[PDB]
């Protein structure tokens, strides 16, 4: 589990969004496994606006923060899980690291701010859903 709180927005894995997230939906994309809902309180997170490929992610299944190198956001085939059939997931970045399904929501961050959230994994590779291209998260 995990979310990003920026301005009056809440960014979560679409497969983990609650009833209240759907009732207060701002934007969602199934192919990215992302959902954004509105909040009443101001958040404190800063979204990175960069093209970094090195950062640190939180892995709840190890209670550890791991420094990693990750690939640029791309369209990648992702095998079936309990939440989606096998399909191409877009805006996805991979690193060599440990992950389990319950690690989804763990934040990946660089020197500039939040880069994305854990979304996929297996075979010793963890996948993160990028959020750096959602420029609208910073305004209004």
Ligand X SMILES: Cn1nc(C(=O)NCCc2cocn2)c2cccnc21
Q: Which residues does the annotation mark as catalytic? A: 15, 33, 104
> What SS3 class is residue 21?
helix
| 52 annotated among ligand-binding-site residues | yes
Of 61, 62, 65, 47, which is closest to residue 130 (Cα–Cα)?
A: 47
Among 121, 130, 132, 134, the residue binding ligand X under the rule CB under 6 A is 121
| 59 annotated among ligand-binding-site residues | no
Of 118, 113, 99, which is closest to residue 44 (Cα–Cα)?
A: 113
Which ranges of the chain would DSSP assign to H, the alpha helix? 19-23
Q: How far is the CB of 49 from Zn ion (least distance, A)?
A: 8
Contact criterion met (CB below 8 Å) for 5 and 114? no
Q: How far is the CB of 12 from ligand X (least distance, A)?
A: 12
Residue 104 sits in the site that holds ligand X (CB under 6 A): yes
Q: What are the beta bridge partners of residue 92?
A: 74, 129
Residue 43 sits in the site that holds ligand X (CB under 6 A): no
What gap in Å lies between CA 13 and CA 2, rounded to an integer? 8
Residue 21 sits in the site that holds ligand X (CB under 6 A): no
Quick one: what does residue 104 bind among ligand X, Zn ion, none, with the CB cut-off 5 to 8 Å set by partner type?
ligand X
Quick one: what does residue 110 bind among ligand X, Zn ion, none, with the CB cut-off 5 to 8 Å set by partner type?
Zn ion
| CB nearer to Zn ion: pick between 17 and 134 | 134
Q: How many helices (H) and strands (E) does the chain have?
A: 1, 11
Binding site for ligand X (CB under 6 A): 15, 33, 78, 81, 83-84, 89, 99-101, 103-104, 118-122, 126
Binding-site annotation: residue ranges for Zn(2+): 50, 52, 110, 112
């Amino acid at each position: 589990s995990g979310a990003i709180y920026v301005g009056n927005y809440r960014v979560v894995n679409r497969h983990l969004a609650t009833h209240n997230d759907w009732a207060n939906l701002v934007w969602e994309d199934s192919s990215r496994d992302l959902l954004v809902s509105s909040t009443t309180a101001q958040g404190c997170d800063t979204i990175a606006r960069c093209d970094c490929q090195t950062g640190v992610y939180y892995c709840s299944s190890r209670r550890k923060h791991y420094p990693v190198s990750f690939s640029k956001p791309s369209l990648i085939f992702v095998e079936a899980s309990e939440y989606y059939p096998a399909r191409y997931q877009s805006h996805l970045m991979l690193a060599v690291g440990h992950s389990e399904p319950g690690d989804c929501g763990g934040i990946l961050r660089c020197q500039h701010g939040v880069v994305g959230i854990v979304s996929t994994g297996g075979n010793g590779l963890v996948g993160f859903a990028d959020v750096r291209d959602l420029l609208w998260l910073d305004e209004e």
